[PDB]
Structure formats: C-alpha cells, structure tokens
Amino acid sequence: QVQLVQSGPGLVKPSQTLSLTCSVSDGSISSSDYYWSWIRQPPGKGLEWIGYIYYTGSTYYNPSLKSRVSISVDRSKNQFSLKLSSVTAADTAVYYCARLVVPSPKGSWFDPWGQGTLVTVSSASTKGPSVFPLAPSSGTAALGCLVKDYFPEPVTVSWNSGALTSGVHTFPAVLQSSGLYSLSSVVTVPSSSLGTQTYICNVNHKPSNTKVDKKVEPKS
Amino acid sequence: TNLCPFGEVFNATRFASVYAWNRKRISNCVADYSVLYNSASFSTFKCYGVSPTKLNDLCFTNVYADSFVIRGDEVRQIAPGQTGNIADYNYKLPDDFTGCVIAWNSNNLDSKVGGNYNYLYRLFRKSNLKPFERDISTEIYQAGSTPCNGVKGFNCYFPLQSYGFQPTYGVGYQPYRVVVLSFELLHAPATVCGK
Amino acid sequence: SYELTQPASVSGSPGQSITISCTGTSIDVGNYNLASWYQQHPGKAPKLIIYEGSRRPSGVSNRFSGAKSGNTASLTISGLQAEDEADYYCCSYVGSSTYVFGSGTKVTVLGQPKANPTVTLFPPSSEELQANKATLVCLISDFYPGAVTVAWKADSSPVKAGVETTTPSKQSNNKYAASSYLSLTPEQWKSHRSYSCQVTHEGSTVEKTVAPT
Ligand SMILES: *[C@@H]1O[C@H](CO)[C@@H](O)[C@H](O)[C@H]1NC(C)=O
C-alpha cells in the first residue's frame, strides 16, 4: 500500500500565499499510472477538487481556481506541493492530497488520501495555549485537561503518550469572544487508580511549536 | 526516379479518428520499403499475402495507405476475419486482404493531460461495415421501439463515442497510430515498384 | 450544470437497505465515465467505497454496491449498521473537464433510543486561580438526540456573561457530546458558595454543583 503524509502551516494571513507539501512513502511518485491531486473541504461543507499533477510536471487545475493555484512535483524527493495565492477567509478549509487513479475511460478514483491539513486564513496572530489540570474530586472518576486561549486550530491531546485511549474524550474547541480557541480533554478512570496510576495529558499545538505535559493529580 | 511520400502518412503530425479513417492514394513512384521493415519503432508489422523482405522486387498499380488511431486492445481487430466494435463499425478488412498492418504506441502524442477527446470511434450501427467501408454518419441511433426524431434520450444514443486518452491509461487503453497498406494489382499498368 | 445532486439526508432501520442517489446532467452511455463513492466519518479523511460504478476496493464490505440508471448513479447499503452513519459523496468527471463531488448525503441509522446526558462539571483549578483566572467547565456526553441547552447558576441565581457553549457533535458511539465554559474572576468565584450547570435534554433536567474548596 501507499501512504501520503501532509505538512504545512495551519495559519496563513489574508492576501498571503498558502503552501502545502505532500510526501509519498511506500511507493514512488514517478509512476506513469497515477496522478497526484489536491482536494479541499471548508469546515461543514463539501469537497472541491483543486488540481493534480503528473510525475513529468504537467498540471491540470480546476478552472475556478486556476488563476490562484500552482501545483509542483519533486520526484527526486518524492513530494508534490500546492500553492494558493491571494488567500481569503473563503479559503479556510481542510486540504487533502490524494492519489488519482485514471487507468481507463471506464472510471477514475482517489485512493489513498492524506490525513488532512486544516489551514485557517485569519489576521489573528498565532498564540500558544495555556494548559490547566482538571483534577478529579470524589467506582469511576473523571479527570482531564483544559487547553485555553490558543490560535489557530487545531491542538492535539493524547494521554500517557498514547498509552491511554479508552475512555478519553477530547471535546471540540470553543470560540471565545476574544477570537481565541479553548478546549478540554477528559478521560474516565477507576477511582482506586488515583493514588498509584499517573495520568499525564500531552498537548501539542503545532502552529506555535509548543508541546506541554501536565500531570493531573487529585485536589489538595 | 524518386521516392514515394510514405513519410507524409507515417510521420504525419495529425491522425484521423478510426471511424473517419484517412486514405492516401499512392501512384507513380518508387517505393523503398527498406525504411519500414528496418525500423525498430513499430509494435505491429503483420503482412498478409506478401512478404516484407520480398516486396522491393514487386510492382503494383495502386497502393492505399489508411491511417487512424485506436486503443491497444483494438489492434488485434485490424486483421482479416476479426470482429468487434472496430472491425464491425469503424474499419473492416476483407478475408482476401493483401497488404500489411502497421501500428505503434502514440501515448506521448495522442494522449493529453486532462483527457484527449478528439479521437472517436463508432459505437452503434445497424449492420457491419463492408470491407474498406467508411461510415461518417452522426444520425441518432435508434436502439428501441419508439423512433427518435434526432434527439438524444432513452434508446436514442449518439453513435460516436470518445476515447478520452490520458497517459495514465493501461497499454490496452492507450492510443495507437495504425497505418494499413493495401496493395492493388489490376489489369492496368503497374505504377508503384521497388528498387 | 456541473452541480452533482444528492439527497441532503437519508435514513433507514438497522439490518435494512438504503439507496443514495447521485443526479447529474452528463448522460454517458454504458460502461463509460463510471462514478465513484466515498465515506467520510467525522474528523476523518474520505474513504473509497465504490469505484468504476460498481467495483469495490479490497477490504470494503460486500454490503456496499453501486449501480447507474443512465442519468443517476446509486450507492446501496444493505444490512444497515451503526457505523454506517456518516457522510457520503459521489464523484464523477463531468463535462470532460473538472472533477466534481456530490452535494453530500448524511446517512442516519434509525431506531436510536433516547439517551440521557451525563454532565461532568469541574471547578477552576488552583493553578489557573493562582494565575488570577477562573473557568468552569461543564461537559455533556452520551445524549441522543443531539440537542441540549445549558443554563449556568451561581448559588441559585442564573448567569449570562462569560458563557460559551459548543454545538453538539457526534461521537464514536453515534451519541452526541457538547461542552460549556463559564469564565469568572477569582473574586466572583470565591464570593458565591457554589456554581451550578443545568443541562436540559428532551424535557429532562440534570444539574451539577461545585463549591470553592
Ligand atoms: C520519420 O522520421 C524519422 C526521423 O524523424 C525517420 O527516421 C523515419 O524514416 C521517418 N519515417 C517515414 C515513414 O518517413
């Protein structure tokens, strides 16, 4: 199987150029049988094909964005990139890279896909979050972490470096009047484990390159 | 005392669609077939009723060069006694065919990025084509009980369909440029010879 | 036309069959320009279910089947299961130019019973308090259908300022989840004896209270 790994800034100021890169693993981008495309999806809306590129450099964009889109390929580094100029708030969307298969006029499909990169177009400056522990107080108890006042989205929260996933509930963020985001992630655990088992949430906010680990201990 | 214009057909910049194949009439010239059989750029070079090497010693009245474009899957149909959408509805060779079938892959030229739809092939026809018949009709094909009146719809389809060539296609779906040479020997003075 | 048309939402009972339509204008004949179908679960990338009108990738259940009635492609899901609840998009090459996706179809599996919400209220942490900030967190989960209203309360008096509430979001078990935040100064928090979070879901009411201790 093949794998697509996306990368790029999640925040682009208005009138600036959006730039993303998709790297291919477990497969060569220099295959004569495949196209390499970009698809975007505004939050809560549908999918829009942006354009694809052949391993030789030939491109074919959606004419609704042809004036603003530039897709390049680097077969030596097994990557292909996307550039969108004069971005606006209308361009805030999750962007996907996908392998486009077109073996015959019978049909064509996208497989596989990248995991998606949320790019927010705004003028608000990047801000790292403040993380406060949600202490349990009481068979099962609930504890968590508070990720407050950050921009832009998203933040990644794991527990015990991924060793705790069952019972974890990372809620969707909330937009505050100040324009900054804030979310909490909690996990329900047995009460008897509070004095022995350690619970640490791992908050990652790539736009600010801030990773913090807050150990959640009972109130005292 | 010259050399026949075989370069105008094979090295042609544009080829016609298979349903509307292009015929070049060759007469009064000296044909050097060594340029063809000694070329390593041909994927198909099947001759019927004659030998490739044993052709420079022969003279013919008229020579017909038919040129078009098809899929790789359909190269096997350019032959006597074959059936299929191409042999039945586009280009038909007789059982007593006397000539050579030459073809080569043209994915780099006739397959566009985004899709080359300029090449067509006839998909519907009431009866099979006679040998060397050329149907260029676009009447709306009636495949049902009700008559059509020249409008598309249920059981009223357009007779031609596009190939939509693109380089990502498999070799059986990639474009192939075909040149069919017909050798004709009538009770007339022979005008096309070899060395 | 170019806009590919799907029903906004379709629904069916568990173990039954549903069909999603995908209407366009380009009338292709036979096995030519066959559509594809994609499943998208919340927060995930689209997953290929059907390609070339009816063929399935390896690993895709045989409960999914594709067909076409000349003008409209159709995705049929037999034996409905709870995880089949997601968004579905058809895709085709329209007008021999651009790749277009359908409007989108939200499949909801019928038969879901009423679920009462589990409220989990937290007080401001001492670390945040020692930073001269205070935020209450009211967490709501496992409620169906996905619509709740939240009313905060200082002692037994309603609050309004500093309240921020999410829209409901479908979680993995097909129930819903929302959260609410009450921002306060540490003075306001220590003044009142307790703050409350009252969640209303389908006429029922669950409350939680926390005190500065
Ligand atoms: C076509 O052109 C090439 C050179 O580009 C030449 O070698 C070849 O013989 C030509 N073929 C014909 C049939 O004239």
Author numbering:
A (entry chain H): 1 to 138, 144 to 225
B (entry chain E): 333 to 527
C (entry chain L): 1 to 213
Sentences from the paper on this structure:
Alpha-B.1.1.7, Beta-B.1.351, Gamma-P.1, and Delta-B.1.617.2 variants of SARS-CoV-2 express multiple mutations in the spike protein (S). The RBD mutations found in Alpha (N501Y), Beta (K417N, E484K, and N501Y), Gamma (K417T, E484K, and N501Y), and Delta (L452R and T478K) are located in or closely adjacent to the ACE2-interacting surface where they have the potential to modulate ACE2 interaction or disrupt the binding of neutralizing mAbs. To understand this, we generated 674 mAbs from Beta-infected individuals and performed a detailed structure-function analysis of the 27 most potent mAbs: one binding the spike N-terminal domain (NTD), the rest the receptor-binding domain (RBD). A detailed structure-function analysis comprising 22 X-ray and cryo-EM structures is presented for 16 Fabs most in complexes with RBD or S, which allows an understanding of the changes in antigenicity of the Beta S protein.
The model is further supported by the structure of the Beta RBD/Beta-24 complex. Beta-24 belongs to the closely related IgVH4-30 gene family with H1 and H2 regions very similar to IgVH4-39 and a canonical H3 length of 15 residues. Beta-24 has a mode of engagement essentially identical to Beta-6, despite having a markedly different sequence within the 15-residue H3. While the interactions in part recapitulate those of Beta-6 there are also differences, the LC interaction area is more than doubled for Beta-24 (to 284 Å2), while the HC contacts are slightly reduced (458 Å2). Nevertheless, some common HC interactions define the similar mode of association. Thus, the hydroxyl group of Tyr-35 forms a hydrogen bond with the RBD carbonyl oxygen of Val-445 and the carbonyl of residue Val-102 interacts with the RBD hydroxyl of Thr-500. However, the interactions with Tyr-501 differ, with a hydrogen bond formed in Beta-6, compared with hydrophobic stacking interactions in Beta-24. Interestingly, the LC interactions are not homologous—in both mAbs a hydrogen bond is formed to the carbonyl of Gly-446; however, in Beta-6 this is contributed by the guanidinium group of Arg-91, while in Beta-24 the hydrogen donor is the hydroxyl group of Tyr-91.
